[PDB]
Amino acid sequence: HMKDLKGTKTAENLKQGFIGESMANRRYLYFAKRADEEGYPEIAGLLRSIAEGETAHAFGHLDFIRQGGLTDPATDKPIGTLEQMIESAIAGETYEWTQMYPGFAKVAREEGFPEVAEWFETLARAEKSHAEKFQNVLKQLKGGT
Amino acid sequence: MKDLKGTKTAENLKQGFIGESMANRRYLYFAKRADEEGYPEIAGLLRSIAEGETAHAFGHLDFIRQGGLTDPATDKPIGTLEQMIESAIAGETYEWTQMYPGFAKVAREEGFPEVAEWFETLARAEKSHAEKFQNVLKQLKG
Ligand SMILES: [Cl-]
Ligand SMILES: [Cl-]
Ligand SMILES: [Mn+2]
Ligand SMILES: [Mn+2]
Ligand SMILES: [Mn+2]
Ligand SMILES: [Mn+2]
């Protein structure tokens, strides 16, 4: 019979699958740039085509998560409706600019890595801008205009 | 070029890479819902912010590689193109030999046969990926 995914090992395996598939697409597109520079177009093309595979895998994991009423792997927020999706976006961006990247920057400065700290501070300011743009979308959706 | 091995900053770059990787995937997935419902401005914003998260993820990988750290996904070096392909092979190999078969068996045990069939499809897919990368690596070393 049909069962709730909530609290199951399968729910956790969909989450972990999503994380790994997300990383695989980013990794393969980064590796493709090195193949591009070095003159390996067949290798770059394969990396890019396999990366599209990993997009399909990630999106299918999110399909089962959303259809199963499970939460966003990144934020533990529901992602059933577009409004919920934007609220998930806002929650993650808010965590990143208010807590995560400032904390990473402080640790980098304290460990003697000022260039890395500056990068984390650039990202904190970027995620704040993202949060603001998503907040404006949510106003448009929630207000129905 | 400063060595990051054994630091909390090394761990933070890894976690930042994971988060940025997920953000790009999430925002492109959300854009498809905006597409279906007729919100092209919202879809376009999601796609443009997703490009931001690509830039963030790649910059984390630059610091990882320049700081003597390993690939977040595989714990393998990714300095050279050959090392990058060997990292791809290692992660594909883990997924087809172990990770997705294991997920499929658990899904069938827990009574999720449709999810199990999906995991079985993915195990076969990652095996094909591993083989295609192996054919590349042989060409590079040759
Ligand atoms: Cl080539
Ligand atoms: Cl719109
Ligand atoms: Mn995959
Ligand atoms: Mn962001
Ligand atoms: Mn980001
Ligand atoms: Mn793969």
Q: Where are the domains of chain A?
A: 1-145
Pairwise CA distance, residues A94 & B131, whole Å: 41
What is the dihedral angle through the alpha carbons of B78, B82, B88, B91, rounded to the nearest 10 degrees? Answer: -70
**Secondary structure (3-state) at B35:** helix
B22 near A CB under 8 A: yes
Reference B142, options B78, B62, B74, B82; nearest CA is: B82
Tell me the resolution in Å: 1.2
**Mutation for A interface: B1, B2, B5, B12, most A CBs within 10 A:** B12
What method was applied to determine this entry?
X-ray
- Write the DSSP symbol of residue A112: T
Which residue shows structure tokens 């490009």? B51
b vs e for A83-98, b when ≥16 Cβ sit within 10 Å of the residue's Cβ? ebbbbbbbbbbbbbbe
3-state per-residue secondary structure call for B1-24: CCCCCCCHHHHHHHHHHHHHHHHH
Instruction: Provide the chain B residues 52-71 that lie in CB contact (below 8 A) with chain A.
Output: 52, 54, 56-59, 61, 63, 67, 71
Pairwise CA distance, residues A128 & A133, whole Å: 9
Pairwise CA distance, residues A73 & A70, whole Å: 9
Instruction: Locate A107 and state its tokens.
Output: 């640790």
